[PDB]
From a paper:
The guanylate-binding proteins (GBPs) play critical roles in cell-autonomous immunity against a diverse range of bacterial, viral, and protozoan pathogens. GBP1 contains an N-terminal large GTPase (LG) domain and a C-terminal helical region, which can be further divided into a middle domain (MD) that contains the α7-α11 helices and a GTPase effector domain (GED) that consists of the α12-α13 helices. Recent studies have discovered that IpaH9.8 ubiquitinates and degrades a subset of GBPs, which is important for S. flexneri to suppress host defense and replicate in the cells.
In the complex structure, it engages GBP1LG using the concave surface of the solenoid. On the other hand, these regions are involved in forming the dimer interface in the LG dimer structure, and therefore binding of IpaH9.8 would lead to the disruption of the GBP1LG dimer. In the structure, seven out of the eight LRR modules in IpaH9.8LRR contribute residues to interact with GBP1. The residues involved in binding GBP1 are unique to IpaH9.8, explaining the fact that only IpaH9.8, but not other IpaH proteins, specifically degrades the GBPs. In our structure, since the GED domain is not present, the MD domain is free to adopt a relaxed conformation. The α7 helix, which is forced to bend in the apo structure due to the interaction between the GED and the LG-MD domains, springs back to the straightened state. In contrast, the GBP1LG-MD structure likely reflects GBP1 at its most relaxed state.
Numbering used by the authors:
A (entry chain B): 22 to 177, 183 to 240
B (entry chain A): 5 to 62, 73 to 156, 167 to 185, 198 to 243, 259 to 479
Write the structure that this text describes.
């Protein structure tokens, strides 16, 4: 319903910490849910958590810059998730219509499913070891500081850079992409043979491969 | 100088750090020494109020904005108001360069000012990841040691709630585990890197008394104890130098290498000395532009004018140049003057030949016509030929400044024009 949303929101208000702006958060929640607002932003509230019931129609959630630990179940209608610079440990399942996942400076350990509608995505400044197959149209990816071991496979305009990781390996799946990809993989302890293998490979008719910055 | 609205100095769009040339023009014009103060902070800590009440007044482009206004408590000096607008707006734009904007606000300013809203809890420290990368983002000698040499004085500002808090608030705890090891890196840098430190507080302006005066104390502090932006032992930064530094740092970021402090000074010296040459050259074409009128009487005169003007223009080089290490510019100036000399000498010889041949024609062509007709083949014309030729040569040399190559060409006339006198004497 609607009046039932106010119940759990007024119940979170009590279960908070001293320096945790919860009255402003509840005010913003009621400001969004009543005006049928698509956007909802809880910018800088020192929140240790979020309520269990977000509005069931928003298309933009900005809960960045907090002390969160785990997000509630995001509504299906969501299309942009801006949740960075807090202390997340795992991401609840992404809505199927998601188009932008902005989560950095957290402590993520692994990423769940990624729908085919992810255009941009930033997972930098975290602790990821493996990634699922990047969707068909994932344009920009930033994993600039993680613990990755192997570069992920793309399911074929593209521009992902995996700066500062412990990957150090390039298979065929990279050299099968045309001259539109851009894979900056600098600051990586790459293989001693693969280090100049790219040099003598790129100094060839490599117009059926990708740009590789290192 | 006079600006009414702060404009963009470095915009952060399309995943690239670019300078604004129109705003660099305004820098290259202000020739007065500068006191640079930045206002770094998150994207909506009310960043503007510390600029309007600092310059003295009353949906944008993100990056570093500047505001130049005359110094209200100093003569000649001009304070610069930098401000990181849109810092951390994860929603609006790219955040590859927030660390870069932080590093540049450090390198350009003379009193770094952070602006947080919280209470310096662990959250306000986790929102300050920019400082843990300064040792990975800024070189200083073509090591993280000589940072206190040029790093600014920290002035923290808590916009909702003084130095008693900060003096012990950064007291890192002792240990060796990885959990406490990360807790050191922010506080270790804010203390060791910055020479002078401070802190401020501001009550809320809603629901003023102890705010307008509260911020007046902080504004008076910044007005009073701010110091001029120095590089390496003096050299008060002043417009053009700030532009050179901005261009050097940005063209280092958007090129790959790290923003160096030594190279950004060496290039500034080699461009502020690359003007000393083109200043001493203009003082050479000007002085030796009306002191020499070719042809000259002798050669020692021209060499005496050179040896004077050369070491007179070398003075102009010394008066507006510094750090010509290995003396590389004070010889490309000299080798550019000795060529001017060696060219002036040949030019003078040619200009002597010109006037000599012209006077030859002008004066002797009447005689050429006279003997060409035959007015001298008469039985008695040899003596009058001698008269006219001798007196005409007498009227040749009484003509000032014929050049050093004076009569050397004149003998080519007489020696190759003696058969006329021969036939005339035979026809006497």
């Amino acid at each position: 319903t609607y009046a039932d949303y106010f119940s759990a929101w007024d119940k979170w208000e009590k279960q908070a910490l001293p320096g945790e702006e919860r009255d402003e958060a509840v005010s913003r929640l009621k400001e969004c849910l009543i005006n049928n607002s698509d956007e909802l932003r809880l910018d800088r509230l020192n929140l240790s958590s979020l309520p269990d019931n977000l509005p069931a129609q928003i298309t933009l959630l900005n809960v960045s810059y907090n002390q969160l630990t785990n997000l509630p179940e995001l509504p299906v209608t969501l299309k942009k998730l801006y949740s960075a610079s807090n202390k997340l440990s795992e991401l609840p399942v992404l809505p199927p219509a998601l188009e932008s996942l902005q989560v950095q400076h957290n402590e993520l350990e692994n990423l769940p499913a990624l729908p085919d509608s992810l255009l941009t995505m930033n997972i930098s400044y975290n602790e990821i070891v493996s990634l699922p197959s990047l969707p068909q149209a994932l344009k920009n990816l930033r994993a600039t500081r993680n613990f990755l071991t192997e570069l992920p496979a793309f399911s074929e305009v593209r521009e992902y850079f995996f700066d500062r990781n412990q990957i150090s390996h390039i298979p065929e799946s990279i050299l099968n992409l045309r001259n539109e990809c851009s894979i900056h993989i600098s600051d990586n302890p790459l293989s001693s043979h693969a280090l100049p293998a790219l040099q003598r490979l790129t100094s060839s008719p490599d117009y059926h491969g990708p740009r590789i910055y290192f | 100088i006079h600006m009414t609205g702060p404009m963009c100095l470095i915009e952060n769009t399309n995943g690239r750090l670019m300078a604004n040339p129109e705003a660099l023009k305004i820098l290259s014009a202000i020739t007065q020494p500068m006191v640079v103060v930045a206002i770094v902070g998150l994207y909506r800590t009310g960043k503007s109020y510390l600029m309007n009440k600092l310059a003295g007044k009353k949906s944008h482009t993100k990056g570093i904005w500047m505001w130049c206004v005359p110094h209200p408590k100093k003569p000649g000096h001009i304070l610069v108001l930098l401000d990181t607008e849109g810092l951390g707006d994860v929603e609006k734009g790219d955040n590859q360069n927030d660390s870069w904007i932080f590093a540049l606000a450090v390198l350009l300013s003379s009193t770094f000012v952070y602006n947080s809203i919280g209470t310096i809890n662990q959250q306000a420290m986790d929102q300050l990841y920019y400082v843990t990368e300064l040792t990975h983002r800024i070189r200083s000698k073509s090591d993280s040691a000589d940072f206190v040499s040029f790093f600014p004085d920290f002035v923290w500002t808590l916009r909702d709630f003084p130095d008693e808090y900060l003096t012990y608030s950064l007291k890192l705890k002792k240990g060796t585990s990885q959990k406490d090891e990360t807790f050191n890196l922010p506080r270790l840098c804010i203390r060791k890197f910055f020479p002078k430190k401070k802190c401020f507080v501001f009550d809320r302006p809603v629901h003023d008394p102890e705010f307008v005066q509260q911020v007046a104390d902080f504004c008076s502090y910044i007005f009073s104890n701010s110091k001029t932006k120095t590089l390496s032992g003096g050299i008060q930064v002043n417009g053009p130098r700030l532009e050179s530094l901005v261009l050097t740092y940005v063209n280092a970021i958007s090129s790959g290498d790290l923003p160096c402090m030594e190279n950004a000074v060496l290039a500034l010296a080699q461009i502020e000395n690359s003007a000393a040459v083109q200043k001493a050259i203009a003082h050479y074409e000007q002085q030796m532009g009306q002191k020499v009128q070719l042809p000259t009487e002798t050669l020692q005169e021209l060499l005496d004018l050179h040896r004077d003007s050369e070491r007179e223009a070398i003075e102009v080089f010394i008066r507006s140049s510094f750090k010509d290490v290995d003396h590389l510019f004070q010889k490309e100036l000299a080798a550019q003057l000795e060529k001017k000399r060696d060219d002036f000498c040949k030019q003078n010889q040619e200009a002597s030949s010109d006037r000599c041949s012209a006077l030859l024609q002008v004066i002797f062509s009447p005689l050429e016509e006279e003997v060409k007709a035959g007015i001298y083949s008469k039985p008695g014309g040899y003596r009058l030929f001698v008269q006219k030729l001798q007196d005409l040569k007498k009227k040749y040399y009484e003509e000032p400044r014929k050049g050093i190559q004076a009569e050397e060409i004149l003998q080519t006339y007489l020696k190759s024009k003696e058969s006329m006198t021969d036939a005339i004497l035979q026809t006497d």
